[PDB]
Symmetry: D2
Subunit: 462 residues, 4 copies
């Protein structure tokens, strides 16, 4: 069963029970590309914004209070998620998001009609607005909320898990590795202090993008001039959004033309997510290499077992959380390339890559948030160190000859490391055998300099 | 509400009506990352492959016919999308696809149990297999099927629509543009013949990757050695798959270690899709620039109206199909970067980025297929040329002085073009008014050489 | 002619006159890959750092004043560029930059020898150091200097040129374009204020990355533990670098392990350069589209003529500066992908992609700096507006019906716009012809609403 | 000292001794961006093409033999490398390469003038040509030559070195690793057979792009219509280029508009180079991990020592060739992103990103060629295997319980692997201790199944 709806292009047959109308139905037929529509977070931001716009139009005496109350009530239902099934339009729609904007207007008009209030989707629900300021506004609201309320707390949780290991393993000595080769001693805690700093720097990177990510185009309307909107429409709508979201990062854009002709704030934010993906790849790769083997690998640490590793090789348990992290990082890198591509190709008064840029940035925020919490809770928290094996590794490195450089010189330390590795003998034995004990180096000096934990120079903790 | 299942790690509470068992349930709790599981096409390939493996194990007398028949029947139901709700594992799972492989084994065991047959998910359903050869095999089957049966016909449809316009507009003269500036004449048909060749070359690029995209790891098992499988398991399974799908491009990998340690065939195929995204961006951008305005743009052609353009500016109609094409192309570029990143980071006997690489390559195939057909049907087929305006544009270009180079020289031809633009005069009148008619250039020569359609040199 | 030099691996034949020694010569034979060595800016940072390290070793009484004075004098010669021909090692060397570190140590030892001072390249010139902290320190010094002293002033110059045009063309009305289609009026000044803000935001993005770009690994030595260096070596060297360069952004890293195991500050900085490339592409594309034609394009503005446009089409002048800008932006995007790839692939205590990451980030800084100044001086400064053509474009847009929405409604405004375009009539006459003048709209109100400059709502 | 030269824009002061003239000098002032001009290979292809064009113009009686002979002689000097110092224009010039085309025309006219032959750079040296067909033609000649004559032989050399190790180490048993964890046995030779296949597939990928990489735009002139050129100019010039280079891969483009409006063949070729970078990353990473330690790593193989590893840690030797390979791969990925970005942004009759695309594709060919030969000669050829350590690693893997699956079942095999790892006992003794010897498994069958070399199933 179908019903007739109309727009300025003509009559359109719409499924009888759908709350959307003519323009949403045309967009359903024009863009069957990915088979996926807007996400819960996107629909929420659109509903929140539509309600705020109706409230301001009402306050300024431009829209009758009964009509504004119907929009506010319908928009609140949309924001809470009661009508996500009424947003069937593909992500790969017209680049301004006109179709999803009209989707919100039409669904509100249908909800209001069930309450006995007649609203025109353009004249009433879209009063003082354009898709060109509302769709990037709803995108930037969703991106700002994803950064502040979800990603930053998830990264803080991962940072705290890494920092707790850095403290726990502060004096657990092991051999450092540079170029994958035997280096001088480090502690496991020192390496984890490095990982924790990468995540802390990741939080700093997200926070540094917020002054421009939180800029909203609302009030600029069609081309940024604010035509058909009151001069204070933008600041009044943002006032409501800040009060209702608690997001102090939300503000009217510094320049109304830049805020619509470009989506540079999304490209900037993706760069921060991409740097986090780069940091997470290093952390996850080191952790699975430390857990490698056990018998054929490094066997430095034990990762918590999360599931049987293999359908054919029995007993084997795999580093599945570092694998999910490195695959998420690859996705964030890909999404980042798509966002920049869209960002660069605006023309004149409008960048028409917004639905695609919105899909990718919001997905990158989601993946990084979810995988960071799982990595912290299901992997980092439960790691255990193989203390004895790590100590043996530290002591086996021929590079432990290095602190003798000031006493015997680099060339003689290299002759010591050579005469030892070839004869499968210790650095200590070789130093004595080459008659190096004397004025330049006593026996007490040698054993003090060769102590692997002292060689790691771990900071003294109170 | 829940039932107990177990694996070698212990007991797991599973939803009472779920057809999956212990290992799928662990994966549900370990990877809640994207909130999306395998696509219909991926589940089909896994079901298809599981059935083919049971058939070969049965043919070789390794699996009792009653057990093999139960796997074949259950796997066919999975392949035919009767149990997609029984595959809840995230894309961002363990990099070998072990979890989705065990998901298929467990769901087949549960289906077989309803038919009165007891199957062990490892010993029976996974006999002669590993996730390490089965999951990349199912990925390469799905990718090969997407290329041959869906993308190539969609690109052929777009090519034919572009070639139809090249023929219809063969003598529709217009001004060429280089660097966005006034150039010599072209026909609108010649431009469309360029677009048609880009799509034809795109088909050639997809076809050229098929010998390596169609390579399957099946038979290599855990590390590529084929341990716990018959020596001819791979060749026998590939023969069953080819007959069951009609997909002749499927083949056993040339090297069983390369086929599991790497996913280079996916990286190669993504490069072809990325080149198609690059070609489509040029075609879609030119088409929306040709349709620009009408009054403030180039207004060369009219795109079919597909929907009201704007919620605030009434009457305005936008080039929505070229916008869908250029956004899809951006996504394919991004997906391509993710595929290469995963492809480079294999280690020793296994590349563990397969679920992520599979997601991206299959999505790129889907988006390009669907948008190419929509672009051909809802945009290219219905384009109309503004023949009058195009003619005025061709004749207005000062670069139409170019065929006079052999008669008056480049330097004098430049002086003519500058003066004609400055005095808002024709090239013809500027040539005469500069006193250039004489022994080197007769008036008949001038009139002959300035004909814009003849200047486009359209093939007879 | 050659001479014999030695290292712990053995004898090496070195060109007789070369100031480098055995380890540089081995690196010349091991890495003939790109055929390009370190840039002037990289050799300066290495020379500056080596001198600062010798000064601190001297201040702490670890190095004899005669030896320290010889290193300081030789390092100052390297810093000034007298010896760039003594750095022949390829960019694509060992990933820590060990070879270029030993190149600096060996060349300083050879220069000091000419002055009668014997220095061991390891024991003296490299005292308290590693390549693992010095090579990323010299990279981060060069990158910080490129950002603060060169790119930010170049972007400020471009911003000021764009802002000057935004002011000069504040009331130069034209038609806005959305989706490349006829939109409501804007001023050329308003568009240029948008471009100005993109560059201003670009400066903010570079400034926001400086707290982490300026972090130096110096003092961490081999693995970040500071082994074989005094405990205050890093803080003393940084203070000397700050006093000598005036770059207050140079600071000791917050974590000595993160500062060597990763190059995340370079990845972060590249992201800011990549965003600037994205902004510059939009600005340059709009400018060449505004200058397009003239007769077959938009012909909105005139770009200064910089060179003859075409070897075959006489008279034609091309937008060469916007083309230089968009090609630089493409390079910065590519360099950005190479930097991130290297950045992700560190292992344990060291990221061994530093020479490649250094090449790409420093090149992106250089290209953006040089093309931004050329774009501001040779293109933006000299632009002229075609004021009458721009006014006719604003008045011709059917979307000028938009401010009537509140009086006649969106649906009627769409019927007005469509009828106006069909009958090739003005919006004003179509409103009167449809009998819309009455209680909801007076002729006085209509004429006020249709004024294109008033419609652009330019700020007072 | 300077001299005056002129073009259609006016008079230009040119350095007295420079062989270039007015347009090259304007380009020197307009584009000081990267500070690097065209490469030796690019200037060679431009010289070769200019000579071939003069020969064809002479053959068709369009150019006086004295003038054609002077161009052919001068173009041969340019192609030979005698005048690379006469090409000062930056890579980041006008996107068509107009400046470098005029650079070639002007330098040829100056060389010819020394023998008393007057040639007009446009009317004579550029007869029947445009920069729009010659600059992409010279780019595609250089790219085709780099692929056929340099990269493919370098990859063949690497393939042969990898295949030689696959043969030598055919029965050198080791433990396989999947997910970096203990897997079933493989041989070192089997892994090298996987590496050899990745390079062999890389050669196949380069060969598959040659039908489109070798397509030349020559003859299409300004916009692809062939205006001001003979109808067979393209086919005649290509015939000369094939005879002089011996490159049968050089062909006239299938469509003259596609060949100039787009550079899709460069994007396609870069995708093959990018796949090779992906393959090389896996191979180089496995090799440095196998050579890791020795005492704190895997210590599976020994890489040849090429230089002292470290300025601070004495004795240490690093895997510098795998590091140069992985950094080259990162650069090829970055260059690939820049090529695709330029490729997608053509407009109408011309893609104006050619100098940037040319720089990146030719650099990717060069880096891959040079690093592949160095990797084969200085690393792969000299590798040695630690045979006894490798066999002990194979025997130590608990996953050697895997071939018992058919006898005791997966669940019981897991119980064996658990007990053995927990009690530090062998798989063999755990099987006996669990009382599994009986009807399903004899002691003789157990010992045959646990033989690690037999478990690797190396081909006879
Ligand atoms: O949908 C709108 O509000 C705007 C559309 C346009 O600029 O075309
Ligand atoms: O699930 C499998 O078949 C393989 C797993 C592994 O290699 O760990
Ligand atoms: O330099 C040429 O041959 C062409 C130039 C143009 O198309 O502008
Ligand atoms: O050259 C150095 O100082 C360090 C080298 C290494 O870690 O191998
Ligand atoms: Ca707050
Ligand atoms: Ca039964
Ligand atoms: Ca041949």
């Amino acid at each position: 069963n179908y019903r007739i709806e109309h727009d300025t292009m003509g009559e359109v047959r719409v499924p009888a029970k759908a709350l959307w109308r003519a323009q949403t139905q045309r967009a359903v037929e024009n863009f069957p590309i990915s088979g996926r529509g807007l996400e819960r977070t996107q629909i929420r931001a659109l509903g929140l914004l539509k309600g705020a716009c109706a409230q301001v139009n009402s306050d300024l005496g431009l829209l009758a209070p009964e009509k504004a109350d119907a929009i506010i009530a319908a928009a609140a239902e949309i924001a809470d998620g009661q009508h996500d099934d009424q947003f069937p339009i593909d992500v790969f729609q017209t680049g301004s998001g006109t179709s999803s904007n009209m989707n919100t207007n039409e669904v509100i008009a249908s909800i209001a009609a069930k309450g006995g209030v007649t609203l025109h989707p353009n004249d009433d629900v879209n009063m003082s607005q354009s898709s060109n300021d509302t769709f990037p506004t709803a995108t930037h609201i969703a991106a700002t909320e994803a950064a502040v309320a979800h990603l930053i707390p998830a990264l803080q949780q991962l940072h705290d898990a890494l920092a707790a290991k850095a403290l726990d393993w502060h004096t657990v000595v092991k051999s450092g590795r540079t170029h994958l080769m035997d280096a001088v001693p480090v502690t496991l805690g020192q390496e984890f202090s490095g990982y924790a700093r990468q995540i802390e720097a990741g939080i700093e990177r997200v926070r540094a993008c917020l002054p421009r990510l939180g800029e909203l185009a609302i009030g600029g309307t069609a081309v940024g001039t604010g035509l058909n909107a009151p001069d204070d429409f933008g600041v009044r709508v943002v006032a409501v959004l800040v009060a209702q979201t608690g997001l102090s990062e939300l503000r009217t854009a510094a320049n109304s033309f830049e805020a619509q002709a470009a989506r540079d704030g999304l490209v900037e934010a993706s760069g921060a997510l991409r740097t986090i993906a780069v940091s997470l790849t290093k952390i996850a790769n080191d952790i699975r290499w430390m857990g490698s083997g056990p018998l054929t690998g490094l066997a430095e640490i034990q990762l918590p077992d999360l599931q049987p590793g293999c359908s054919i090789m029995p007993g084997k348990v795999n580093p599945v959380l570092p694998e999910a992290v490195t695959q998420v990082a690859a996705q964030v890198i890909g999404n980042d390339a798509a966002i920049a591509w869209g960002g660069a190709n605006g023309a004149f008064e409008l960048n028409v890559y917004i639905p695609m840029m919105a899909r990718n940035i919001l997905e990158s925020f989601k993946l990084l948030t979810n995988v960071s919490r799982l990595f912290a809770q299901r992997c980092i928290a439960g790691l255990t160190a193989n203390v004895e094996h790590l100590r043996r590794l530290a002591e086996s490195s021929p590079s432990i000859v290095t602190p003798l450089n000031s006493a015997i010189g680099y060339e003689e330390a290299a002759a010591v490391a050579k005469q030892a590795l070839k004869e499968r003998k210790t650095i200590r034995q070789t130093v004595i055998d080459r008659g190096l004990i004397g004025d330049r180096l006593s026996i007490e000096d040698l054993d003090r300099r060769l102590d692997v934990l002292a060689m790691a120079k771990a900071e003294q903790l109170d």
